[model samples]
Target: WFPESMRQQLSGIFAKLTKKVTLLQFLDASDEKSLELQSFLTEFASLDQKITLETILKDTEPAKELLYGIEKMPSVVLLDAAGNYTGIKFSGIPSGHEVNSLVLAVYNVGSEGQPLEASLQKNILALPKRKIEIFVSLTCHFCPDVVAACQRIASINPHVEAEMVDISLFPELKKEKKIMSVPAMLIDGEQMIFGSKTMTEIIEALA
Candidate 1:
């Protein structure tokens, strides 16, 4: 649980760094605890930033909104400055590694341009399956690199289409798919890899 003062401080920083930070609270239909938690979070938002709050009154609500599939709750999300989503979600309370992740998301949404290696670009184009997917969000700094690299690969291979999904936009998918990390890559719908790996790793996967 966060004290009001801390939330205020964090909110100030968030406002300075990004356009807005929204907080959505999940509530179980019959769970008093869920309502209590929601109330706590709602009040917490008062401490800082311009927070928008939404409540998931029932389990069905999240799914209905296409926010289902993820088993985690009270996920914090960051949106890009263009209001285009950078798909990132923090499960549970975002502390430790999670907090840093959110900070990165803010930066990514605010910045543009990414750099990729030349050799990596060449290898991606040679792959037969041109369908490339880069799962990224506002928080992961390295995510753009993956996107840029894939873009280069897609450029040479017109058959390949690179699609980016904002995980935060689809909550249920996160839980159902058991995705606990950001900047994950899914190539050809079969191979799933995590973290920022070297170009060789991607080459070997494509091979």
Candidate 2:
């Protein structure tokens, strides 16, 4: 049985916060079990804070275009209120670290306030010449935080420009730089600053 009660409780919080919850249940229509899953979701709509289920039987729709090419299935997809695909949850039972990721997903769906401190801005302006390249992918949750940090730094200094390279889209750059993970920033395309770093950490690298 689906945990309609628990899901409702979580969904209610988002709904009250004026956040839209869209659920795309990945399943093949021909499969009898998938049909059963579909029926369960239809019944789930009766509960409070219902989830809008978009079932994809055939992969023709532009909305499910990414799902078509991907080999994985039976995934939970999350999109922002603006309908940009943020990430996907593949775990059938959301457990362990998945809970934290889910909570962040909920917060990201509702939260919009990511601004840097004014004091940090002053520090960033002191840098005369800086070339920053941040490697990221749309699916990497931590990538946004790193990207935001870069954006904030760039906003403070005219000489600095944050170049965010999507590793998935630009495989050549990834290979050239030997980037093994997301949220990695390179200074002048040579100095590799691994992991999400703060303004101070970034400025320290320049020195």
Candidate 3:
């Protein structure tokens, strides 16, 4: 699903990985949509030798999903070389603009991303376990910005995992959660934000 130019650009990014990274795929055999995702992932896995791809079943392998705290199928969980979950995930096909967060997640887990600075690091690394979900739709075009910010914080500290959700797949949630806008963020399953906010501000809200 990636063009040559795009593949070249992404290959350059993954080339700097200091440690190997794992892209764990969770999908259901009954669902054909996941097959499409698997195809794309197969292509993506070939981009870098440091990245190893593994596929697991959603129904048969409940433990893997439970261990990673994954809530959706067609999910790609990013892990460290030793297969340790770093709390970064992309639900649904990570095509379109969602590729931005997916790329950052892989790089952040496999290599060092932007320095968080001392103060930010202290606050982030010491923070309690929390989950950040950025609900997005590729059509919105702005969700990736917020997704990147959340993944940035999550990568620095595994205790705070970030997941980018393609809301279209979960229609039931839309009515129940009052998801009236794209780029909506949920923290710890309780606090909800309507739009994009600064990373510093998101951290502030966590407290």
lDDT of 3 at 2: 87
The predictions' CA RMSDs to the true structure, in order, are: 9.0, 9.9, 1.5
* RMSD (CA, angstroms), candidate 3: 1.5
Residues 97-137 of candidate 2 have per-residue lDDT tens digits of 22333344444444542454766656766777676666666
Off by over 4 Å in 1: 1-122
lDDT of 3 by residue, 144-178 (tens): 88888888788777688888888898888877887
Q: How much is the lDDT of residue 19 in candidate 1?
A: 49
- lDDT (10s digit) by residue, model 1, range 106-170: 43343332355667656655677545555666566776666545444443454554445556656
Clash total of candidate 2: 0
**Each candidate's lDDT (Cα)?**
0.52, 0.54, 0.83
Instruction: Quote the positional error of residue 145 for candidate 3 in Å.
Output: 2.1
- TM per candidate: 0.41, 0.44, 0.93
lDDT for residue 121 in candidate 1, whole number 0-100: 59
